[PDB]
């Protein structure tokens, strides 16, 4: 189970606050996964005191984007910290998908990758296994052309237009051992859709914690 409690001194009514939270949730908390088990108790509550004494915030307010960004960054930061503290994790994994049919599909593809047990274990082993990543792209349910996919792990492009690049495996492994977060980038070359998802590696300690060892 995750919980998050967010407080602000912004003056804002409950309707506009709710609209912001609902939108932000879809790009932050709903884009993380540790083990794929959706809990019976997950909840986020935001409370706004109004004690900053600004003029009440709505999307028409000239400084709306300031408030919105602060709230979004706060939720993103907390979501990333949850993912990083996945049971047994040694690494946060960030997946960014570009070139999807739309932003929703980019998000679904990104999450499918970070939720794959084969991807999660490869990262634990410091294995730059683009094969496992592309397999997850393929079963995501999204619009995919299998011949036009680029995959990078950190700054190392491992697959370009669905052809392996002959990258240094020693270099890729070195990156995976030191990076936090580990960043995977995917371009599907379908449209303009972009999205991120976050997760963690799958380690022996996940099993120890959850099997009562």
């Amino acid at each position: 189970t995750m919980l998050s409690f967010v407080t602000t001194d912004a003056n804002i009514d409950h309707g506009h606050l709710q609209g912001a939270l609902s939108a932000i949730t879809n790009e932050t908390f709903n884009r993380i996964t540790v083990d794929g088990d959706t809990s019976t108790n997950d909840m986020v509550v935001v409370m706004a005191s109004g004690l900053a004494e600004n003029e009440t915030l709505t999307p028409e307010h000239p400084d709306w984007a300031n408030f919105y960004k602060a709230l979004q960054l706060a939720c993103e930061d907390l979501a990333k910290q949850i993912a990083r503290d996945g049971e047994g994790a040694t690494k946060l994994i960030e997946v960014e998908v570009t070139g999807a049919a739309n932003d929703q599909e980019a998000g679904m593809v990104a999450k499918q990758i970070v939720g794959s047990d084969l991807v999660k274990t490869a990262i634990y082993g410091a294995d730059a296994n683009w094969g496992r990543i592309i397999c997850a792209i393929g079963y995501s349910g999204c619009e995919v052309n299998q011949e036009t996919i680029d995959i990078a792990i950190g700054p190392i492009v491992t697959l370009k237009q669905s052809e392996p690049t002959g990258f240094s495996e020693e270099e890729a492994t070195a990156y995976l051992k030191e990076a936090d977060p580990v960043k995977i980038s995917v371009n599907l070359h379908i449209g303009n859709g972009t999205g991120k998802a976050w997760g963690c590696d799958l380690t022996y300690d996940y099993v120890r914690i959850n099997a009562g060892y």
């Binding site: 967010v6 001194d9 993380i32 004690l51």
Partner: protein, 191 residues
């Protein structure tokens, strides 16, 4: 857009004007704090999202009912160790009781009190322990208060999880602070 947004690394939920927090150890957990509250000195506009799992813990409903009255809260009370999930009518009664005892403790309307739980599924709350604990809660507008609250919501977590960002609205400093928990059974699907 019209002003930068800056991260405050030592901030938390108590960094926003109006808010106090606390966590205490009631004994449901062996060592860590296991009951906490955040409170606001004025009625605060409130928003929430909730798991779409069709098996849902009682307090989520209770919190929704509070927020539905005026869209405002003054207290958020949380226990950890026991989820109050799959506890049926008795569990729902227990969540209403937590809300009522919280309202008494903080001298505010029941509908300004939200409640939740996290931890073991199917176990009933030890209500003498929880209710006595709620009455002892003394929120403070301090970073230590925020950290004690965050400890009080953890389950399997190895660390607390804090955030704080500040920006400017109408020339006023606006602060957004937060805490979170979660380590296992994590795949949120909330609305």
């Amino acid at each position: 857009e019209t002003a930068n947004v800056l991260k405050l690394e030592t901030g938390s939920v108590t960094s926003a004007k109006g808010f106090s927090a606390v966590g205490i150890h009631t004994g449901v957990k062996r060592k860590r704090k296991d009951l906490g509250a955040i409170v606001c000195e004025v009625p605060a506009s409130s928003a929430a999202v909730y798991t779409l799992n069709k098996v849902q813990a009682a307090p989520l409903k209770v919190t929704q009912e509070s927020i539905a009255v005026e869209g405002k809260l003054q207290a958020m009370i949380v226990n950890s160790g026991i989820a109050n999930a799959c506890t049926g009518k008795r569990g729902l009664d227990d969540a209403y009781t937590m809300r009522a005892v919280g309202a008494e403790t903080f001298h505010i309307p029941e509908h300004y009190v939200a409640v939740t739980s996290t931890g073991v599924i199917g176990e009933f709350l030890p209500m003498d322990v929880i209710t006595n604990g709620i009455r002892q809660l003394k929120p403070e507008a301090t970073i230590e208060g925020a950290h004690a609250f965050n400890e009080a919501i953890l389950t399997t977590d190895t660390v607390e999880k804090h955030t704080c960002y500040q920006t400017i609205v109408n020339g006023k400093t606006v602060t957004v602070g937060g805490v979170a928990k979660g380590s296992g059974m994590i795949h949120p699907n909330m609305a």
